[PDB]
Design a binder for this molecule. Structure first.
Ligand SMILES: CSCC[C@H](N)C(O)(O)c1ccccn1
Ligand SMILES: [Co+2]
Ligand SMILES: [Co+2]
Ligand SMILES: [Co+2]
Length: 249
């Protein structure tokens, strides 16, 4: 959406805080021996406490409060009896609405230690890619600068991006204009960012695969080659004085 009023701004900040709090609480609770359903139950309780509703449940009839994707799963994983293990690469993606307004945020991290440093590397590079993307965000700037920055960051680190997962506008719905915030540069795109525009920026950095495919069920996205993939996602408001992240707290 485009923010035009202080009441809209406040509503976005409220739901962003709630999603950040949930994301942080879930991440802190992720340890070997917890199941992904038990982690999802944290979101259930917190959404109730804060008067928010799961966007996956509301918008998509997704069977889970949140999306929790482990190892071979990159996105849209269904919380279940799956147990977290030492060295897992976990993505927790929290999106919700309150009073009609939305936020969307996500983080990938390594549980304990993996024997392969590549798991942490993709996380480190996803973080850098996010930072580099938002350093580009201002009214009048090209949307495509975001994907250009993300892919350049990946290349600087000998990594790839997931080309077929994107960010998106957010605000009155989970997904709205701009339709797609790519992870790479499209030289033909003339779309600009504008003052008050709200978008979810979510680089996906991969150790090998450049795309995801349908996974073990009708929701999860995976890589057949079991690439290590990390996401960092925030909801961002484009302002004259710099990007405001509703989901950073
Ligand atoms: C209601 S379904 C949840 C969608 C998710 N929060 C996402 O928009 O960030 C996303 C994640 C992965 C790929 C694309 N989009
Ligand atoms: Co998300
Ligand atoms: Co999405
Ligand atoms: Co998103």
């Amino acid at each position: 959406m485009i923010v035009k009023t202080e009441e809209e701004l406040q509503a976005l900040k409220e739901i962003g805080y709630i999603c950040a709090k949930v994301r942080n609480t879930m991440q802190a609770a992720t340890k070997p021996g917890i199941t992904t359903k038990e982690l999802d139950n944290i979101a259930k309780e917190l959404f109730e406490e804060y008067g928010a509703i799961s966007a996956p449940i509301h918008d998509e009839n997704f069977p889970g409060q949140t999306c929790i994707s482990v190892n071979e799963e990159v996105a849209h994983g269904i919380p279940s009896k799956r147990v977290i293990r030492e060295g897992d690469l976990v993505n927790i993606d929290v999106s919700a609405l309150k009073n009609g307004y939305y936020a969307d945020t996500g983080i990938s991290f390594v549980v304990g230690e993996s024997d392969d440093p590549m798991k942490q590397k993709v996380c480190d590079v996803a973080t850098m890619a996010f930072e580099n993307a938002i350093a580009k965000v201002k009214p009048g700037t090209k949307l495509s600068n975001i994907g250009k920055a993300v892919h350049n960051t990946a290349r600087q680190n000998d990594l790839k991006v997931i080309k077929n997962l994107t960010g998106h506008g957010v605000g009155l719905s989970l997904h709205e204009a701009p339709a797609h915030v790519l992870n790479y540069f499209d030289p033909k795109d003339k779309t600009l960012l504008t003052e008050g525009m709200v978008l979810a920026i979510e680089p996906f950095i991969s150790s090998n695969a450049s795309f995801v495919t349908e996974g073990k069920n009708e929701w999860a996205f995976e890589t057949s080659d079991k690439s290590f993939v990390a996401q960092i996602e925030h909801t961002v408001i484009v302002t004259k004085d710099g990007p405001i992240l509703t989901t950073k707290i």
